[PDB]
Amino acid sequence: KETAAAKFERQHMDSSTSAASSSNYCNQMMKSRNLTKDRCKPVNTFVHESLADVQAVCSQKNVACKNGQTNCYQSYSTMSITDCRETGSSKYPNCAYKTTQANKHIIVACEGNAYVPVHFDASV
Amino acid sequence: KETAAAKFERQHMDSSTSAASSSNYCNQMMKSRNLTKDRCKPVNTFVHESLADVQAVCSQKNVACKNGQTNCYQSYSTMSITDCRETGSSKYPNCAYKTTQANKHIIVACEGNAYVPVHFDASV
Ligand SMILES: [Cl-]
Ligand SMILES: [Cl-]
Numbered sequence: 001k002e003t004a005a006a007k008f009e010r011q012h013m014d015s016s017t018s019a020a021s022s023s024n025y026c027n028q029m030m031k032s033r034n035l036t037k038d039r040c041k042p043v044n045t046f047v048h049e050s051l052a053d054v055q056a057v058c059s060q061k062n063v064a065c066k067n068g069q070t071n072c073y074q075s076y077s078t079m080s081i082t083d084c085r086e087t088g089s090s091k092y093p094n095c096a097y098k099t100t101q102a103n104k105h106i107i108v109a110c111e112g113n114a115y116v117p118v119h120f121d122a123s124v
Numbered sequence: 125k126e127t128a129a130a131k132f133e134r135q136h137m138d139s140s141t142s143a144a145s146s147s148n149y150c151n152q153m154m155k156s157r158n159l160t161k162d163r164c165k166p167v168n169t170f171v172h173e174s175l176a177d178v179q180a181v182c183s184q185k186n187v188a189c190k191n192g193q194t195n196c197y198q199s200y201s202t203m204s205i206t207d208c209r210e211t212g213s214s215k216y217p218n219c220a221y222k223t224t225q226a227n228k229h230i231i232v233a234c235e236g237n238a239y240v241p242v243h244f245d246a247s248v
Contacts, residue, residue, distance in 0.1 A: 042188035043246075062212035063222055064166035070212055074224070083248040085231075088186035088194055098187055100198070100248045104228065107209075122167075122246060124207040124224045 004111065004118040011035065012120045013054060014046040019080050019101050026084035026097035040086055040095040045120055047106060048080035054117060058110035065121050071109050072121050078103040081123055128235065128242040135159065136244045137178060138170040143204050143225050150208035150221035164210055164219040169244055171230060172204035178241060182234035189245050195233050196245050202227040205247055 002010070010033055020026070035041040047054050057075040065072035083100040090096035104123040111118045126134070134157055144150070159165040171178050181199040189196035207224040214220035228247040235242045 042192045043190045061222065064210035064212075064214075066167045068166045070210075074209070074222070085198070086188035086194075088188075090188075098185065098198070100229065102228065102248055104226065104248075105224065123248070124226055124228075 005114070005116045008108075008117045008119065009051065011041075012045055012047055012117075013051055014048055014082070015050050018048055020046075020048075020082040020099050023099050025082060025101075026099040027095070029082075030084055030095060030097055036093070036095040038092075040090055040092045042086050044084045045106075045123060046082045046084065047120075048082065053079070054106070054108070057106060057108055058115050058117060063107060065107075065109050065119075069109065071111055072107050073110060074107040074124065075105045077105065079106055081106060083123075129238070129240045132232075132241045132243065133175065135165075136169055136171055136241075137175055138172055138206070139174050142172055144170075144172075144206040144223050147223050149206060149225075150223040151219070153206075154208055154219060154221055160217070160219040162216075164214055164216045166210050168208045169230075169247060170206045170208065171244075172206065177203070178230070178232070181230060181232055182239050182241060187231060189231075189233050189243075193233065195235055196231050197234060198231040198248065199229045201229065203230055205230060207247075 061074045087096040107121045108117040109119040185198045211220040232241040233243040
């Protein structure tokens with residue numbers, strides 16, 4: 001059992017690097033964050049900002065989530081992020097990922113109190 | 125009954141402008157594309173490129189869809205796009221939208237043959 005807040009940190013936070021390293025960043029990160037354990041997670045985004053900057057997004061712009069809920073927030077500024085998506089030539093347990101580095105606003109759903117990010121909804 | 129291809133064109137294509145006009149672009153577009161008819165669509169992206177450039181994305185990078193399917197493609201280049209998302213101060217039939225203009229790769233699911241975009245999966 002992992003708290004929803006802890007799961008968000010593990011799947012989406014990468015404060016140790018300013019941006020994706022090389023084309024192998026995703027294969028390495030998806031593996032060490034245990035996102036390739038029983039299955040290959042198809043899509044996952046990593047945010048390269050402090051945990052505190054990502055958490056502050058829960059007090060930023062209140063916007064709707066793609067699912068219609070209203071506890072999503074879009075960051076006022078763009079953040080360094082890296083999208084990891086399985087390549088068509090990927091097959092569990094030999095997971096393969098395309099790394100796409102970019103700067104975009106992130107939108108996250110927040111919940112609990114402490115009111116922290118619990119789901120990565122999208123980047124803009 | 126609208127074909128899936130026709131629905132994608134109507135919800136996501138805006139080849140008539142190079143980029144979102146002003147902060148009211150989304151209120152105007154979501155209304156005239158009939159996305160505010162019986163309900164307020166919570167999130168919707170418009171692509172400002174030709175229909176032909178968007179359709180060519182179906183022969184570009186084959187990547188997985190957030191849902192795990194494998195018929196998604198990410199465009200090799202960034203495209204002018206505009207994200208429209210309901211503000212927390214939006215309530216049907218007085219739909220309210222935040223307009224966020226940006227340049228990102230788009231990822232779309234393609235299907236049918238003619239093999240054309242049928243769903244906007246995400247932008248990167
Ligand atoms: Cl994600
Ligand atoms: Cl959309």
